[PDB]
Design a protein around this ligand. Structure first.
Ligand SMILES: Cc1cn([C@H]2C[C@H](O)[C@@H](COP(=O)(O)OP(=O)(O)O[C@H]3O[C@H](C)[C@@H](N)[C@H](O)[C@H]3O)O2)c(=O)[nH]c1=O
Ligand SMILES: Cc1cn([C@H]2C[C@H](O)[C@@H](COP(=O)(O)OP(=O)(O)O[C@H]3O[C@H](C)[C@@H](N)[C@H](O)[C@H]3O)O2)c(=O)[nH]c1=O
Ligand SMILES: Nc1nc(=O)c2nc(CNc3ccc(C(=O)N[C@@H](CCC(=O)O)C(=O)O)cc3)cnc2[nH]1
Ligand SMILES: Nc1nc(=O)c2nc(CNc3ccc(C(=O)N[C@@H](CCC(=O)O)C(=O)O)cc3)cnc2[nH]1
Ligand code: NA
Lengths: 246, 251
């Protein structure tokens, strides 16, 4: 372990997947040590404690200096914290993004893609000052079908993240890649745009197709996303399922 | 020349295990009222999945069989339809006191799945206990109770509330029905009947239909009832996408 890699992750499936990859690839990583941390802002990180992860604060000046001093590479695997410029500028940082940059950069890309029909998939990219913005190292589109909810597309994106990590984790550690730029401008969706979508307008006029697309975009297993307000301020949450039958 | 200080036979025809099982128990609990009444239970011949009814020891009857009609007219003083899948012929309803337990509020959305139609057309729903004539869900109202429909109700939500009201009416009125302790004034309000083919038509979604999100949500919640395959759209290659919606009140 001459080379120290930090995995900062708030996503148990990806953490579990990477730990297994490194275990079965011990020959490729004999001179590499991997530490795993979850991010300070995580509001239920108990599941990640089970896999030996402990909190790190990527916006603490103390932790940034320690990371910069100790680690050759930081991998963000759905890290809930924005890396400060002092981290991304002073150590090689690579993000695993559950969108196809530069389309629907930011929050819950597949929700926006079900509605706006822009591509989705996984992008592994160098991390710069801005969010889901740096040089593309590896990316792979995943198709969307008319019977998909957010959950269906998200599970598909996660299987593509895992496929790219299986093929490219060592490439990422040993910098065996080519930095690529998109010719397209793309777009960003923030947490406030998602809150916007969630507030249903029952008076909104449109096609059943558009309304079904909105509701399937906002349907994600047990999450309470799409709602309208009753007069008394109570909420009605709406979920939709779509099931293909040959 | 001296008074000592004969058996009524009631036939219950039913294709609904919850009702049958509930009525069987209700008879036991009112057994002090039914010293001289015996209840026989049968399910409909056309019943495609009778298993759970055969497990309660019910056997089939065919209300369109000349022979079965003769046996009923021969043997029973009263027939009660409790969610019976078969239409009674004129030869049964005209010759025997027949009473239907209907999960709608007559005369509104008579016929199939009344709460599905009510969620959409805002007509009332509930339970109606009525005399059976030759027409469907049409004879004189004996007892009925409306149940509310909420914005956040599916078909399943309204149906369960109707089932509770049906059980409440039977608790209060099963003896009353048997012993004709009721009033039976005719209504000249015809209302509206929905057939099975009207339900099947609602089920075929038009993705191009323009409306409010409210009206689209109301249609999909009306057509959502547990795991039933109701609402669908047709794909070019003939396949179907089934659509279900849930609505959950959170205070
Ligand atoms: C919290 C929440 C999640 N979801 C669905 C949509 C999400 O895409 C999916 C996974 O949610 P999650 O919070 O694990 O999010 P992650 O899959 O970890 O990813 C999200 O945060 C990362 C820090 C960012 N790098 C991503 O761009 C962002 O989309 O679950 C909902 O439908 N509603 C919710 O309230
Ligand atoms: C078969 C079927 C049922 N349902 C829902 C809506 C219904 O109100 C509810 C219960 O229906 P049910 O037929 O399973 O059980 P019941 O309400 O007991 O209906 C019975 O007595 C009625 C007077 C007759 N119209 C029915 O043919 C007979 O089956 O289930 C659906 O949403 N879709 C369906 O295809
Ligand atoms: N500087 C930086 N660049 C990135 O591309 C990056 N990628 C992920 C994106 N993660 C997040 C987490 C929270 C929010 C938020 O808006 N709250 C946004 C993006 C991890 N941090 C990064 N930090
Ligand atoms: N003659 C008659 N009148 C009724 O009011 C009545 N009520 C129920 C309603 N049940 C049904 C069952 C199936 C179909 C149908 O096949 N169409 C209609 C009504 C039972 N039979 C009745 N039969
Ligand atoms: Na509901």
């Amino acid at each position: 372990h001459m080379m120290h890699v930090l995995i900062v992750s708030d996503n148990k499936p990806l953490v579990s997947f990477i730990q297994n990859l490194v275990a079965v690839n011990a020959d490729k990583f004999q001179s590499v040590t991997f530490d795993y941390r979850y991010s300070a802002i995580n509001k239920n990180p108990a599941s990640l404690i089970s896999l030996g992860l402990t909190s790190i604060n990527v916006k603490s000046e103390k932790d940034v200096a320690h990371i910069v001093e100790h680690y050759e590479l930081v991998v963000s695997a759905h890290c809930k914290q924005i890396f400060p410029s002092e981290l991304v500028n002073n150590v090689r940082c690579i993000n695993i993004h559950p969108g196809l940059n530069p389309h629907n950069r930011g929050w819950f890309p597949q929700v926006f893609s079900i509605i706006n029909k822009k591509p989705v998939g996984c992008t592994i990219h160098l991390m710069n000052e801005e969010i889901d913005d740096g040089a593309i190292l590896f990316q792979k589109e995943v198709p969307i079908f008319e019977w998909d909810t957010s959950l269906n597309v998200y599970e598909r994106v996660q299987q593509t993240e895992m496929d790219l990590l299986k093929d490219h984790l060592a490439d990422l550690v040993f910098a065996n890649y080519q930095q690529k730029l998109s010719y397209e401008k793309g777009n960003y969706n923030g947490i406030s745009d998602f809150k916007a979508l969630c507030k249903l307008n029952l008076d909104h006029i449109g096609t059943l197709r558009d309304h079904i697309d909105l509701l399937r975009a906002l349907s994600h297993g047990d999450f309470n996303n799409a709602y309208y307000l009753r007069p008394d301020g109570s909420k009605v949450y709406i979920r939709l399922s779509a099931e293909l039958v040959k």
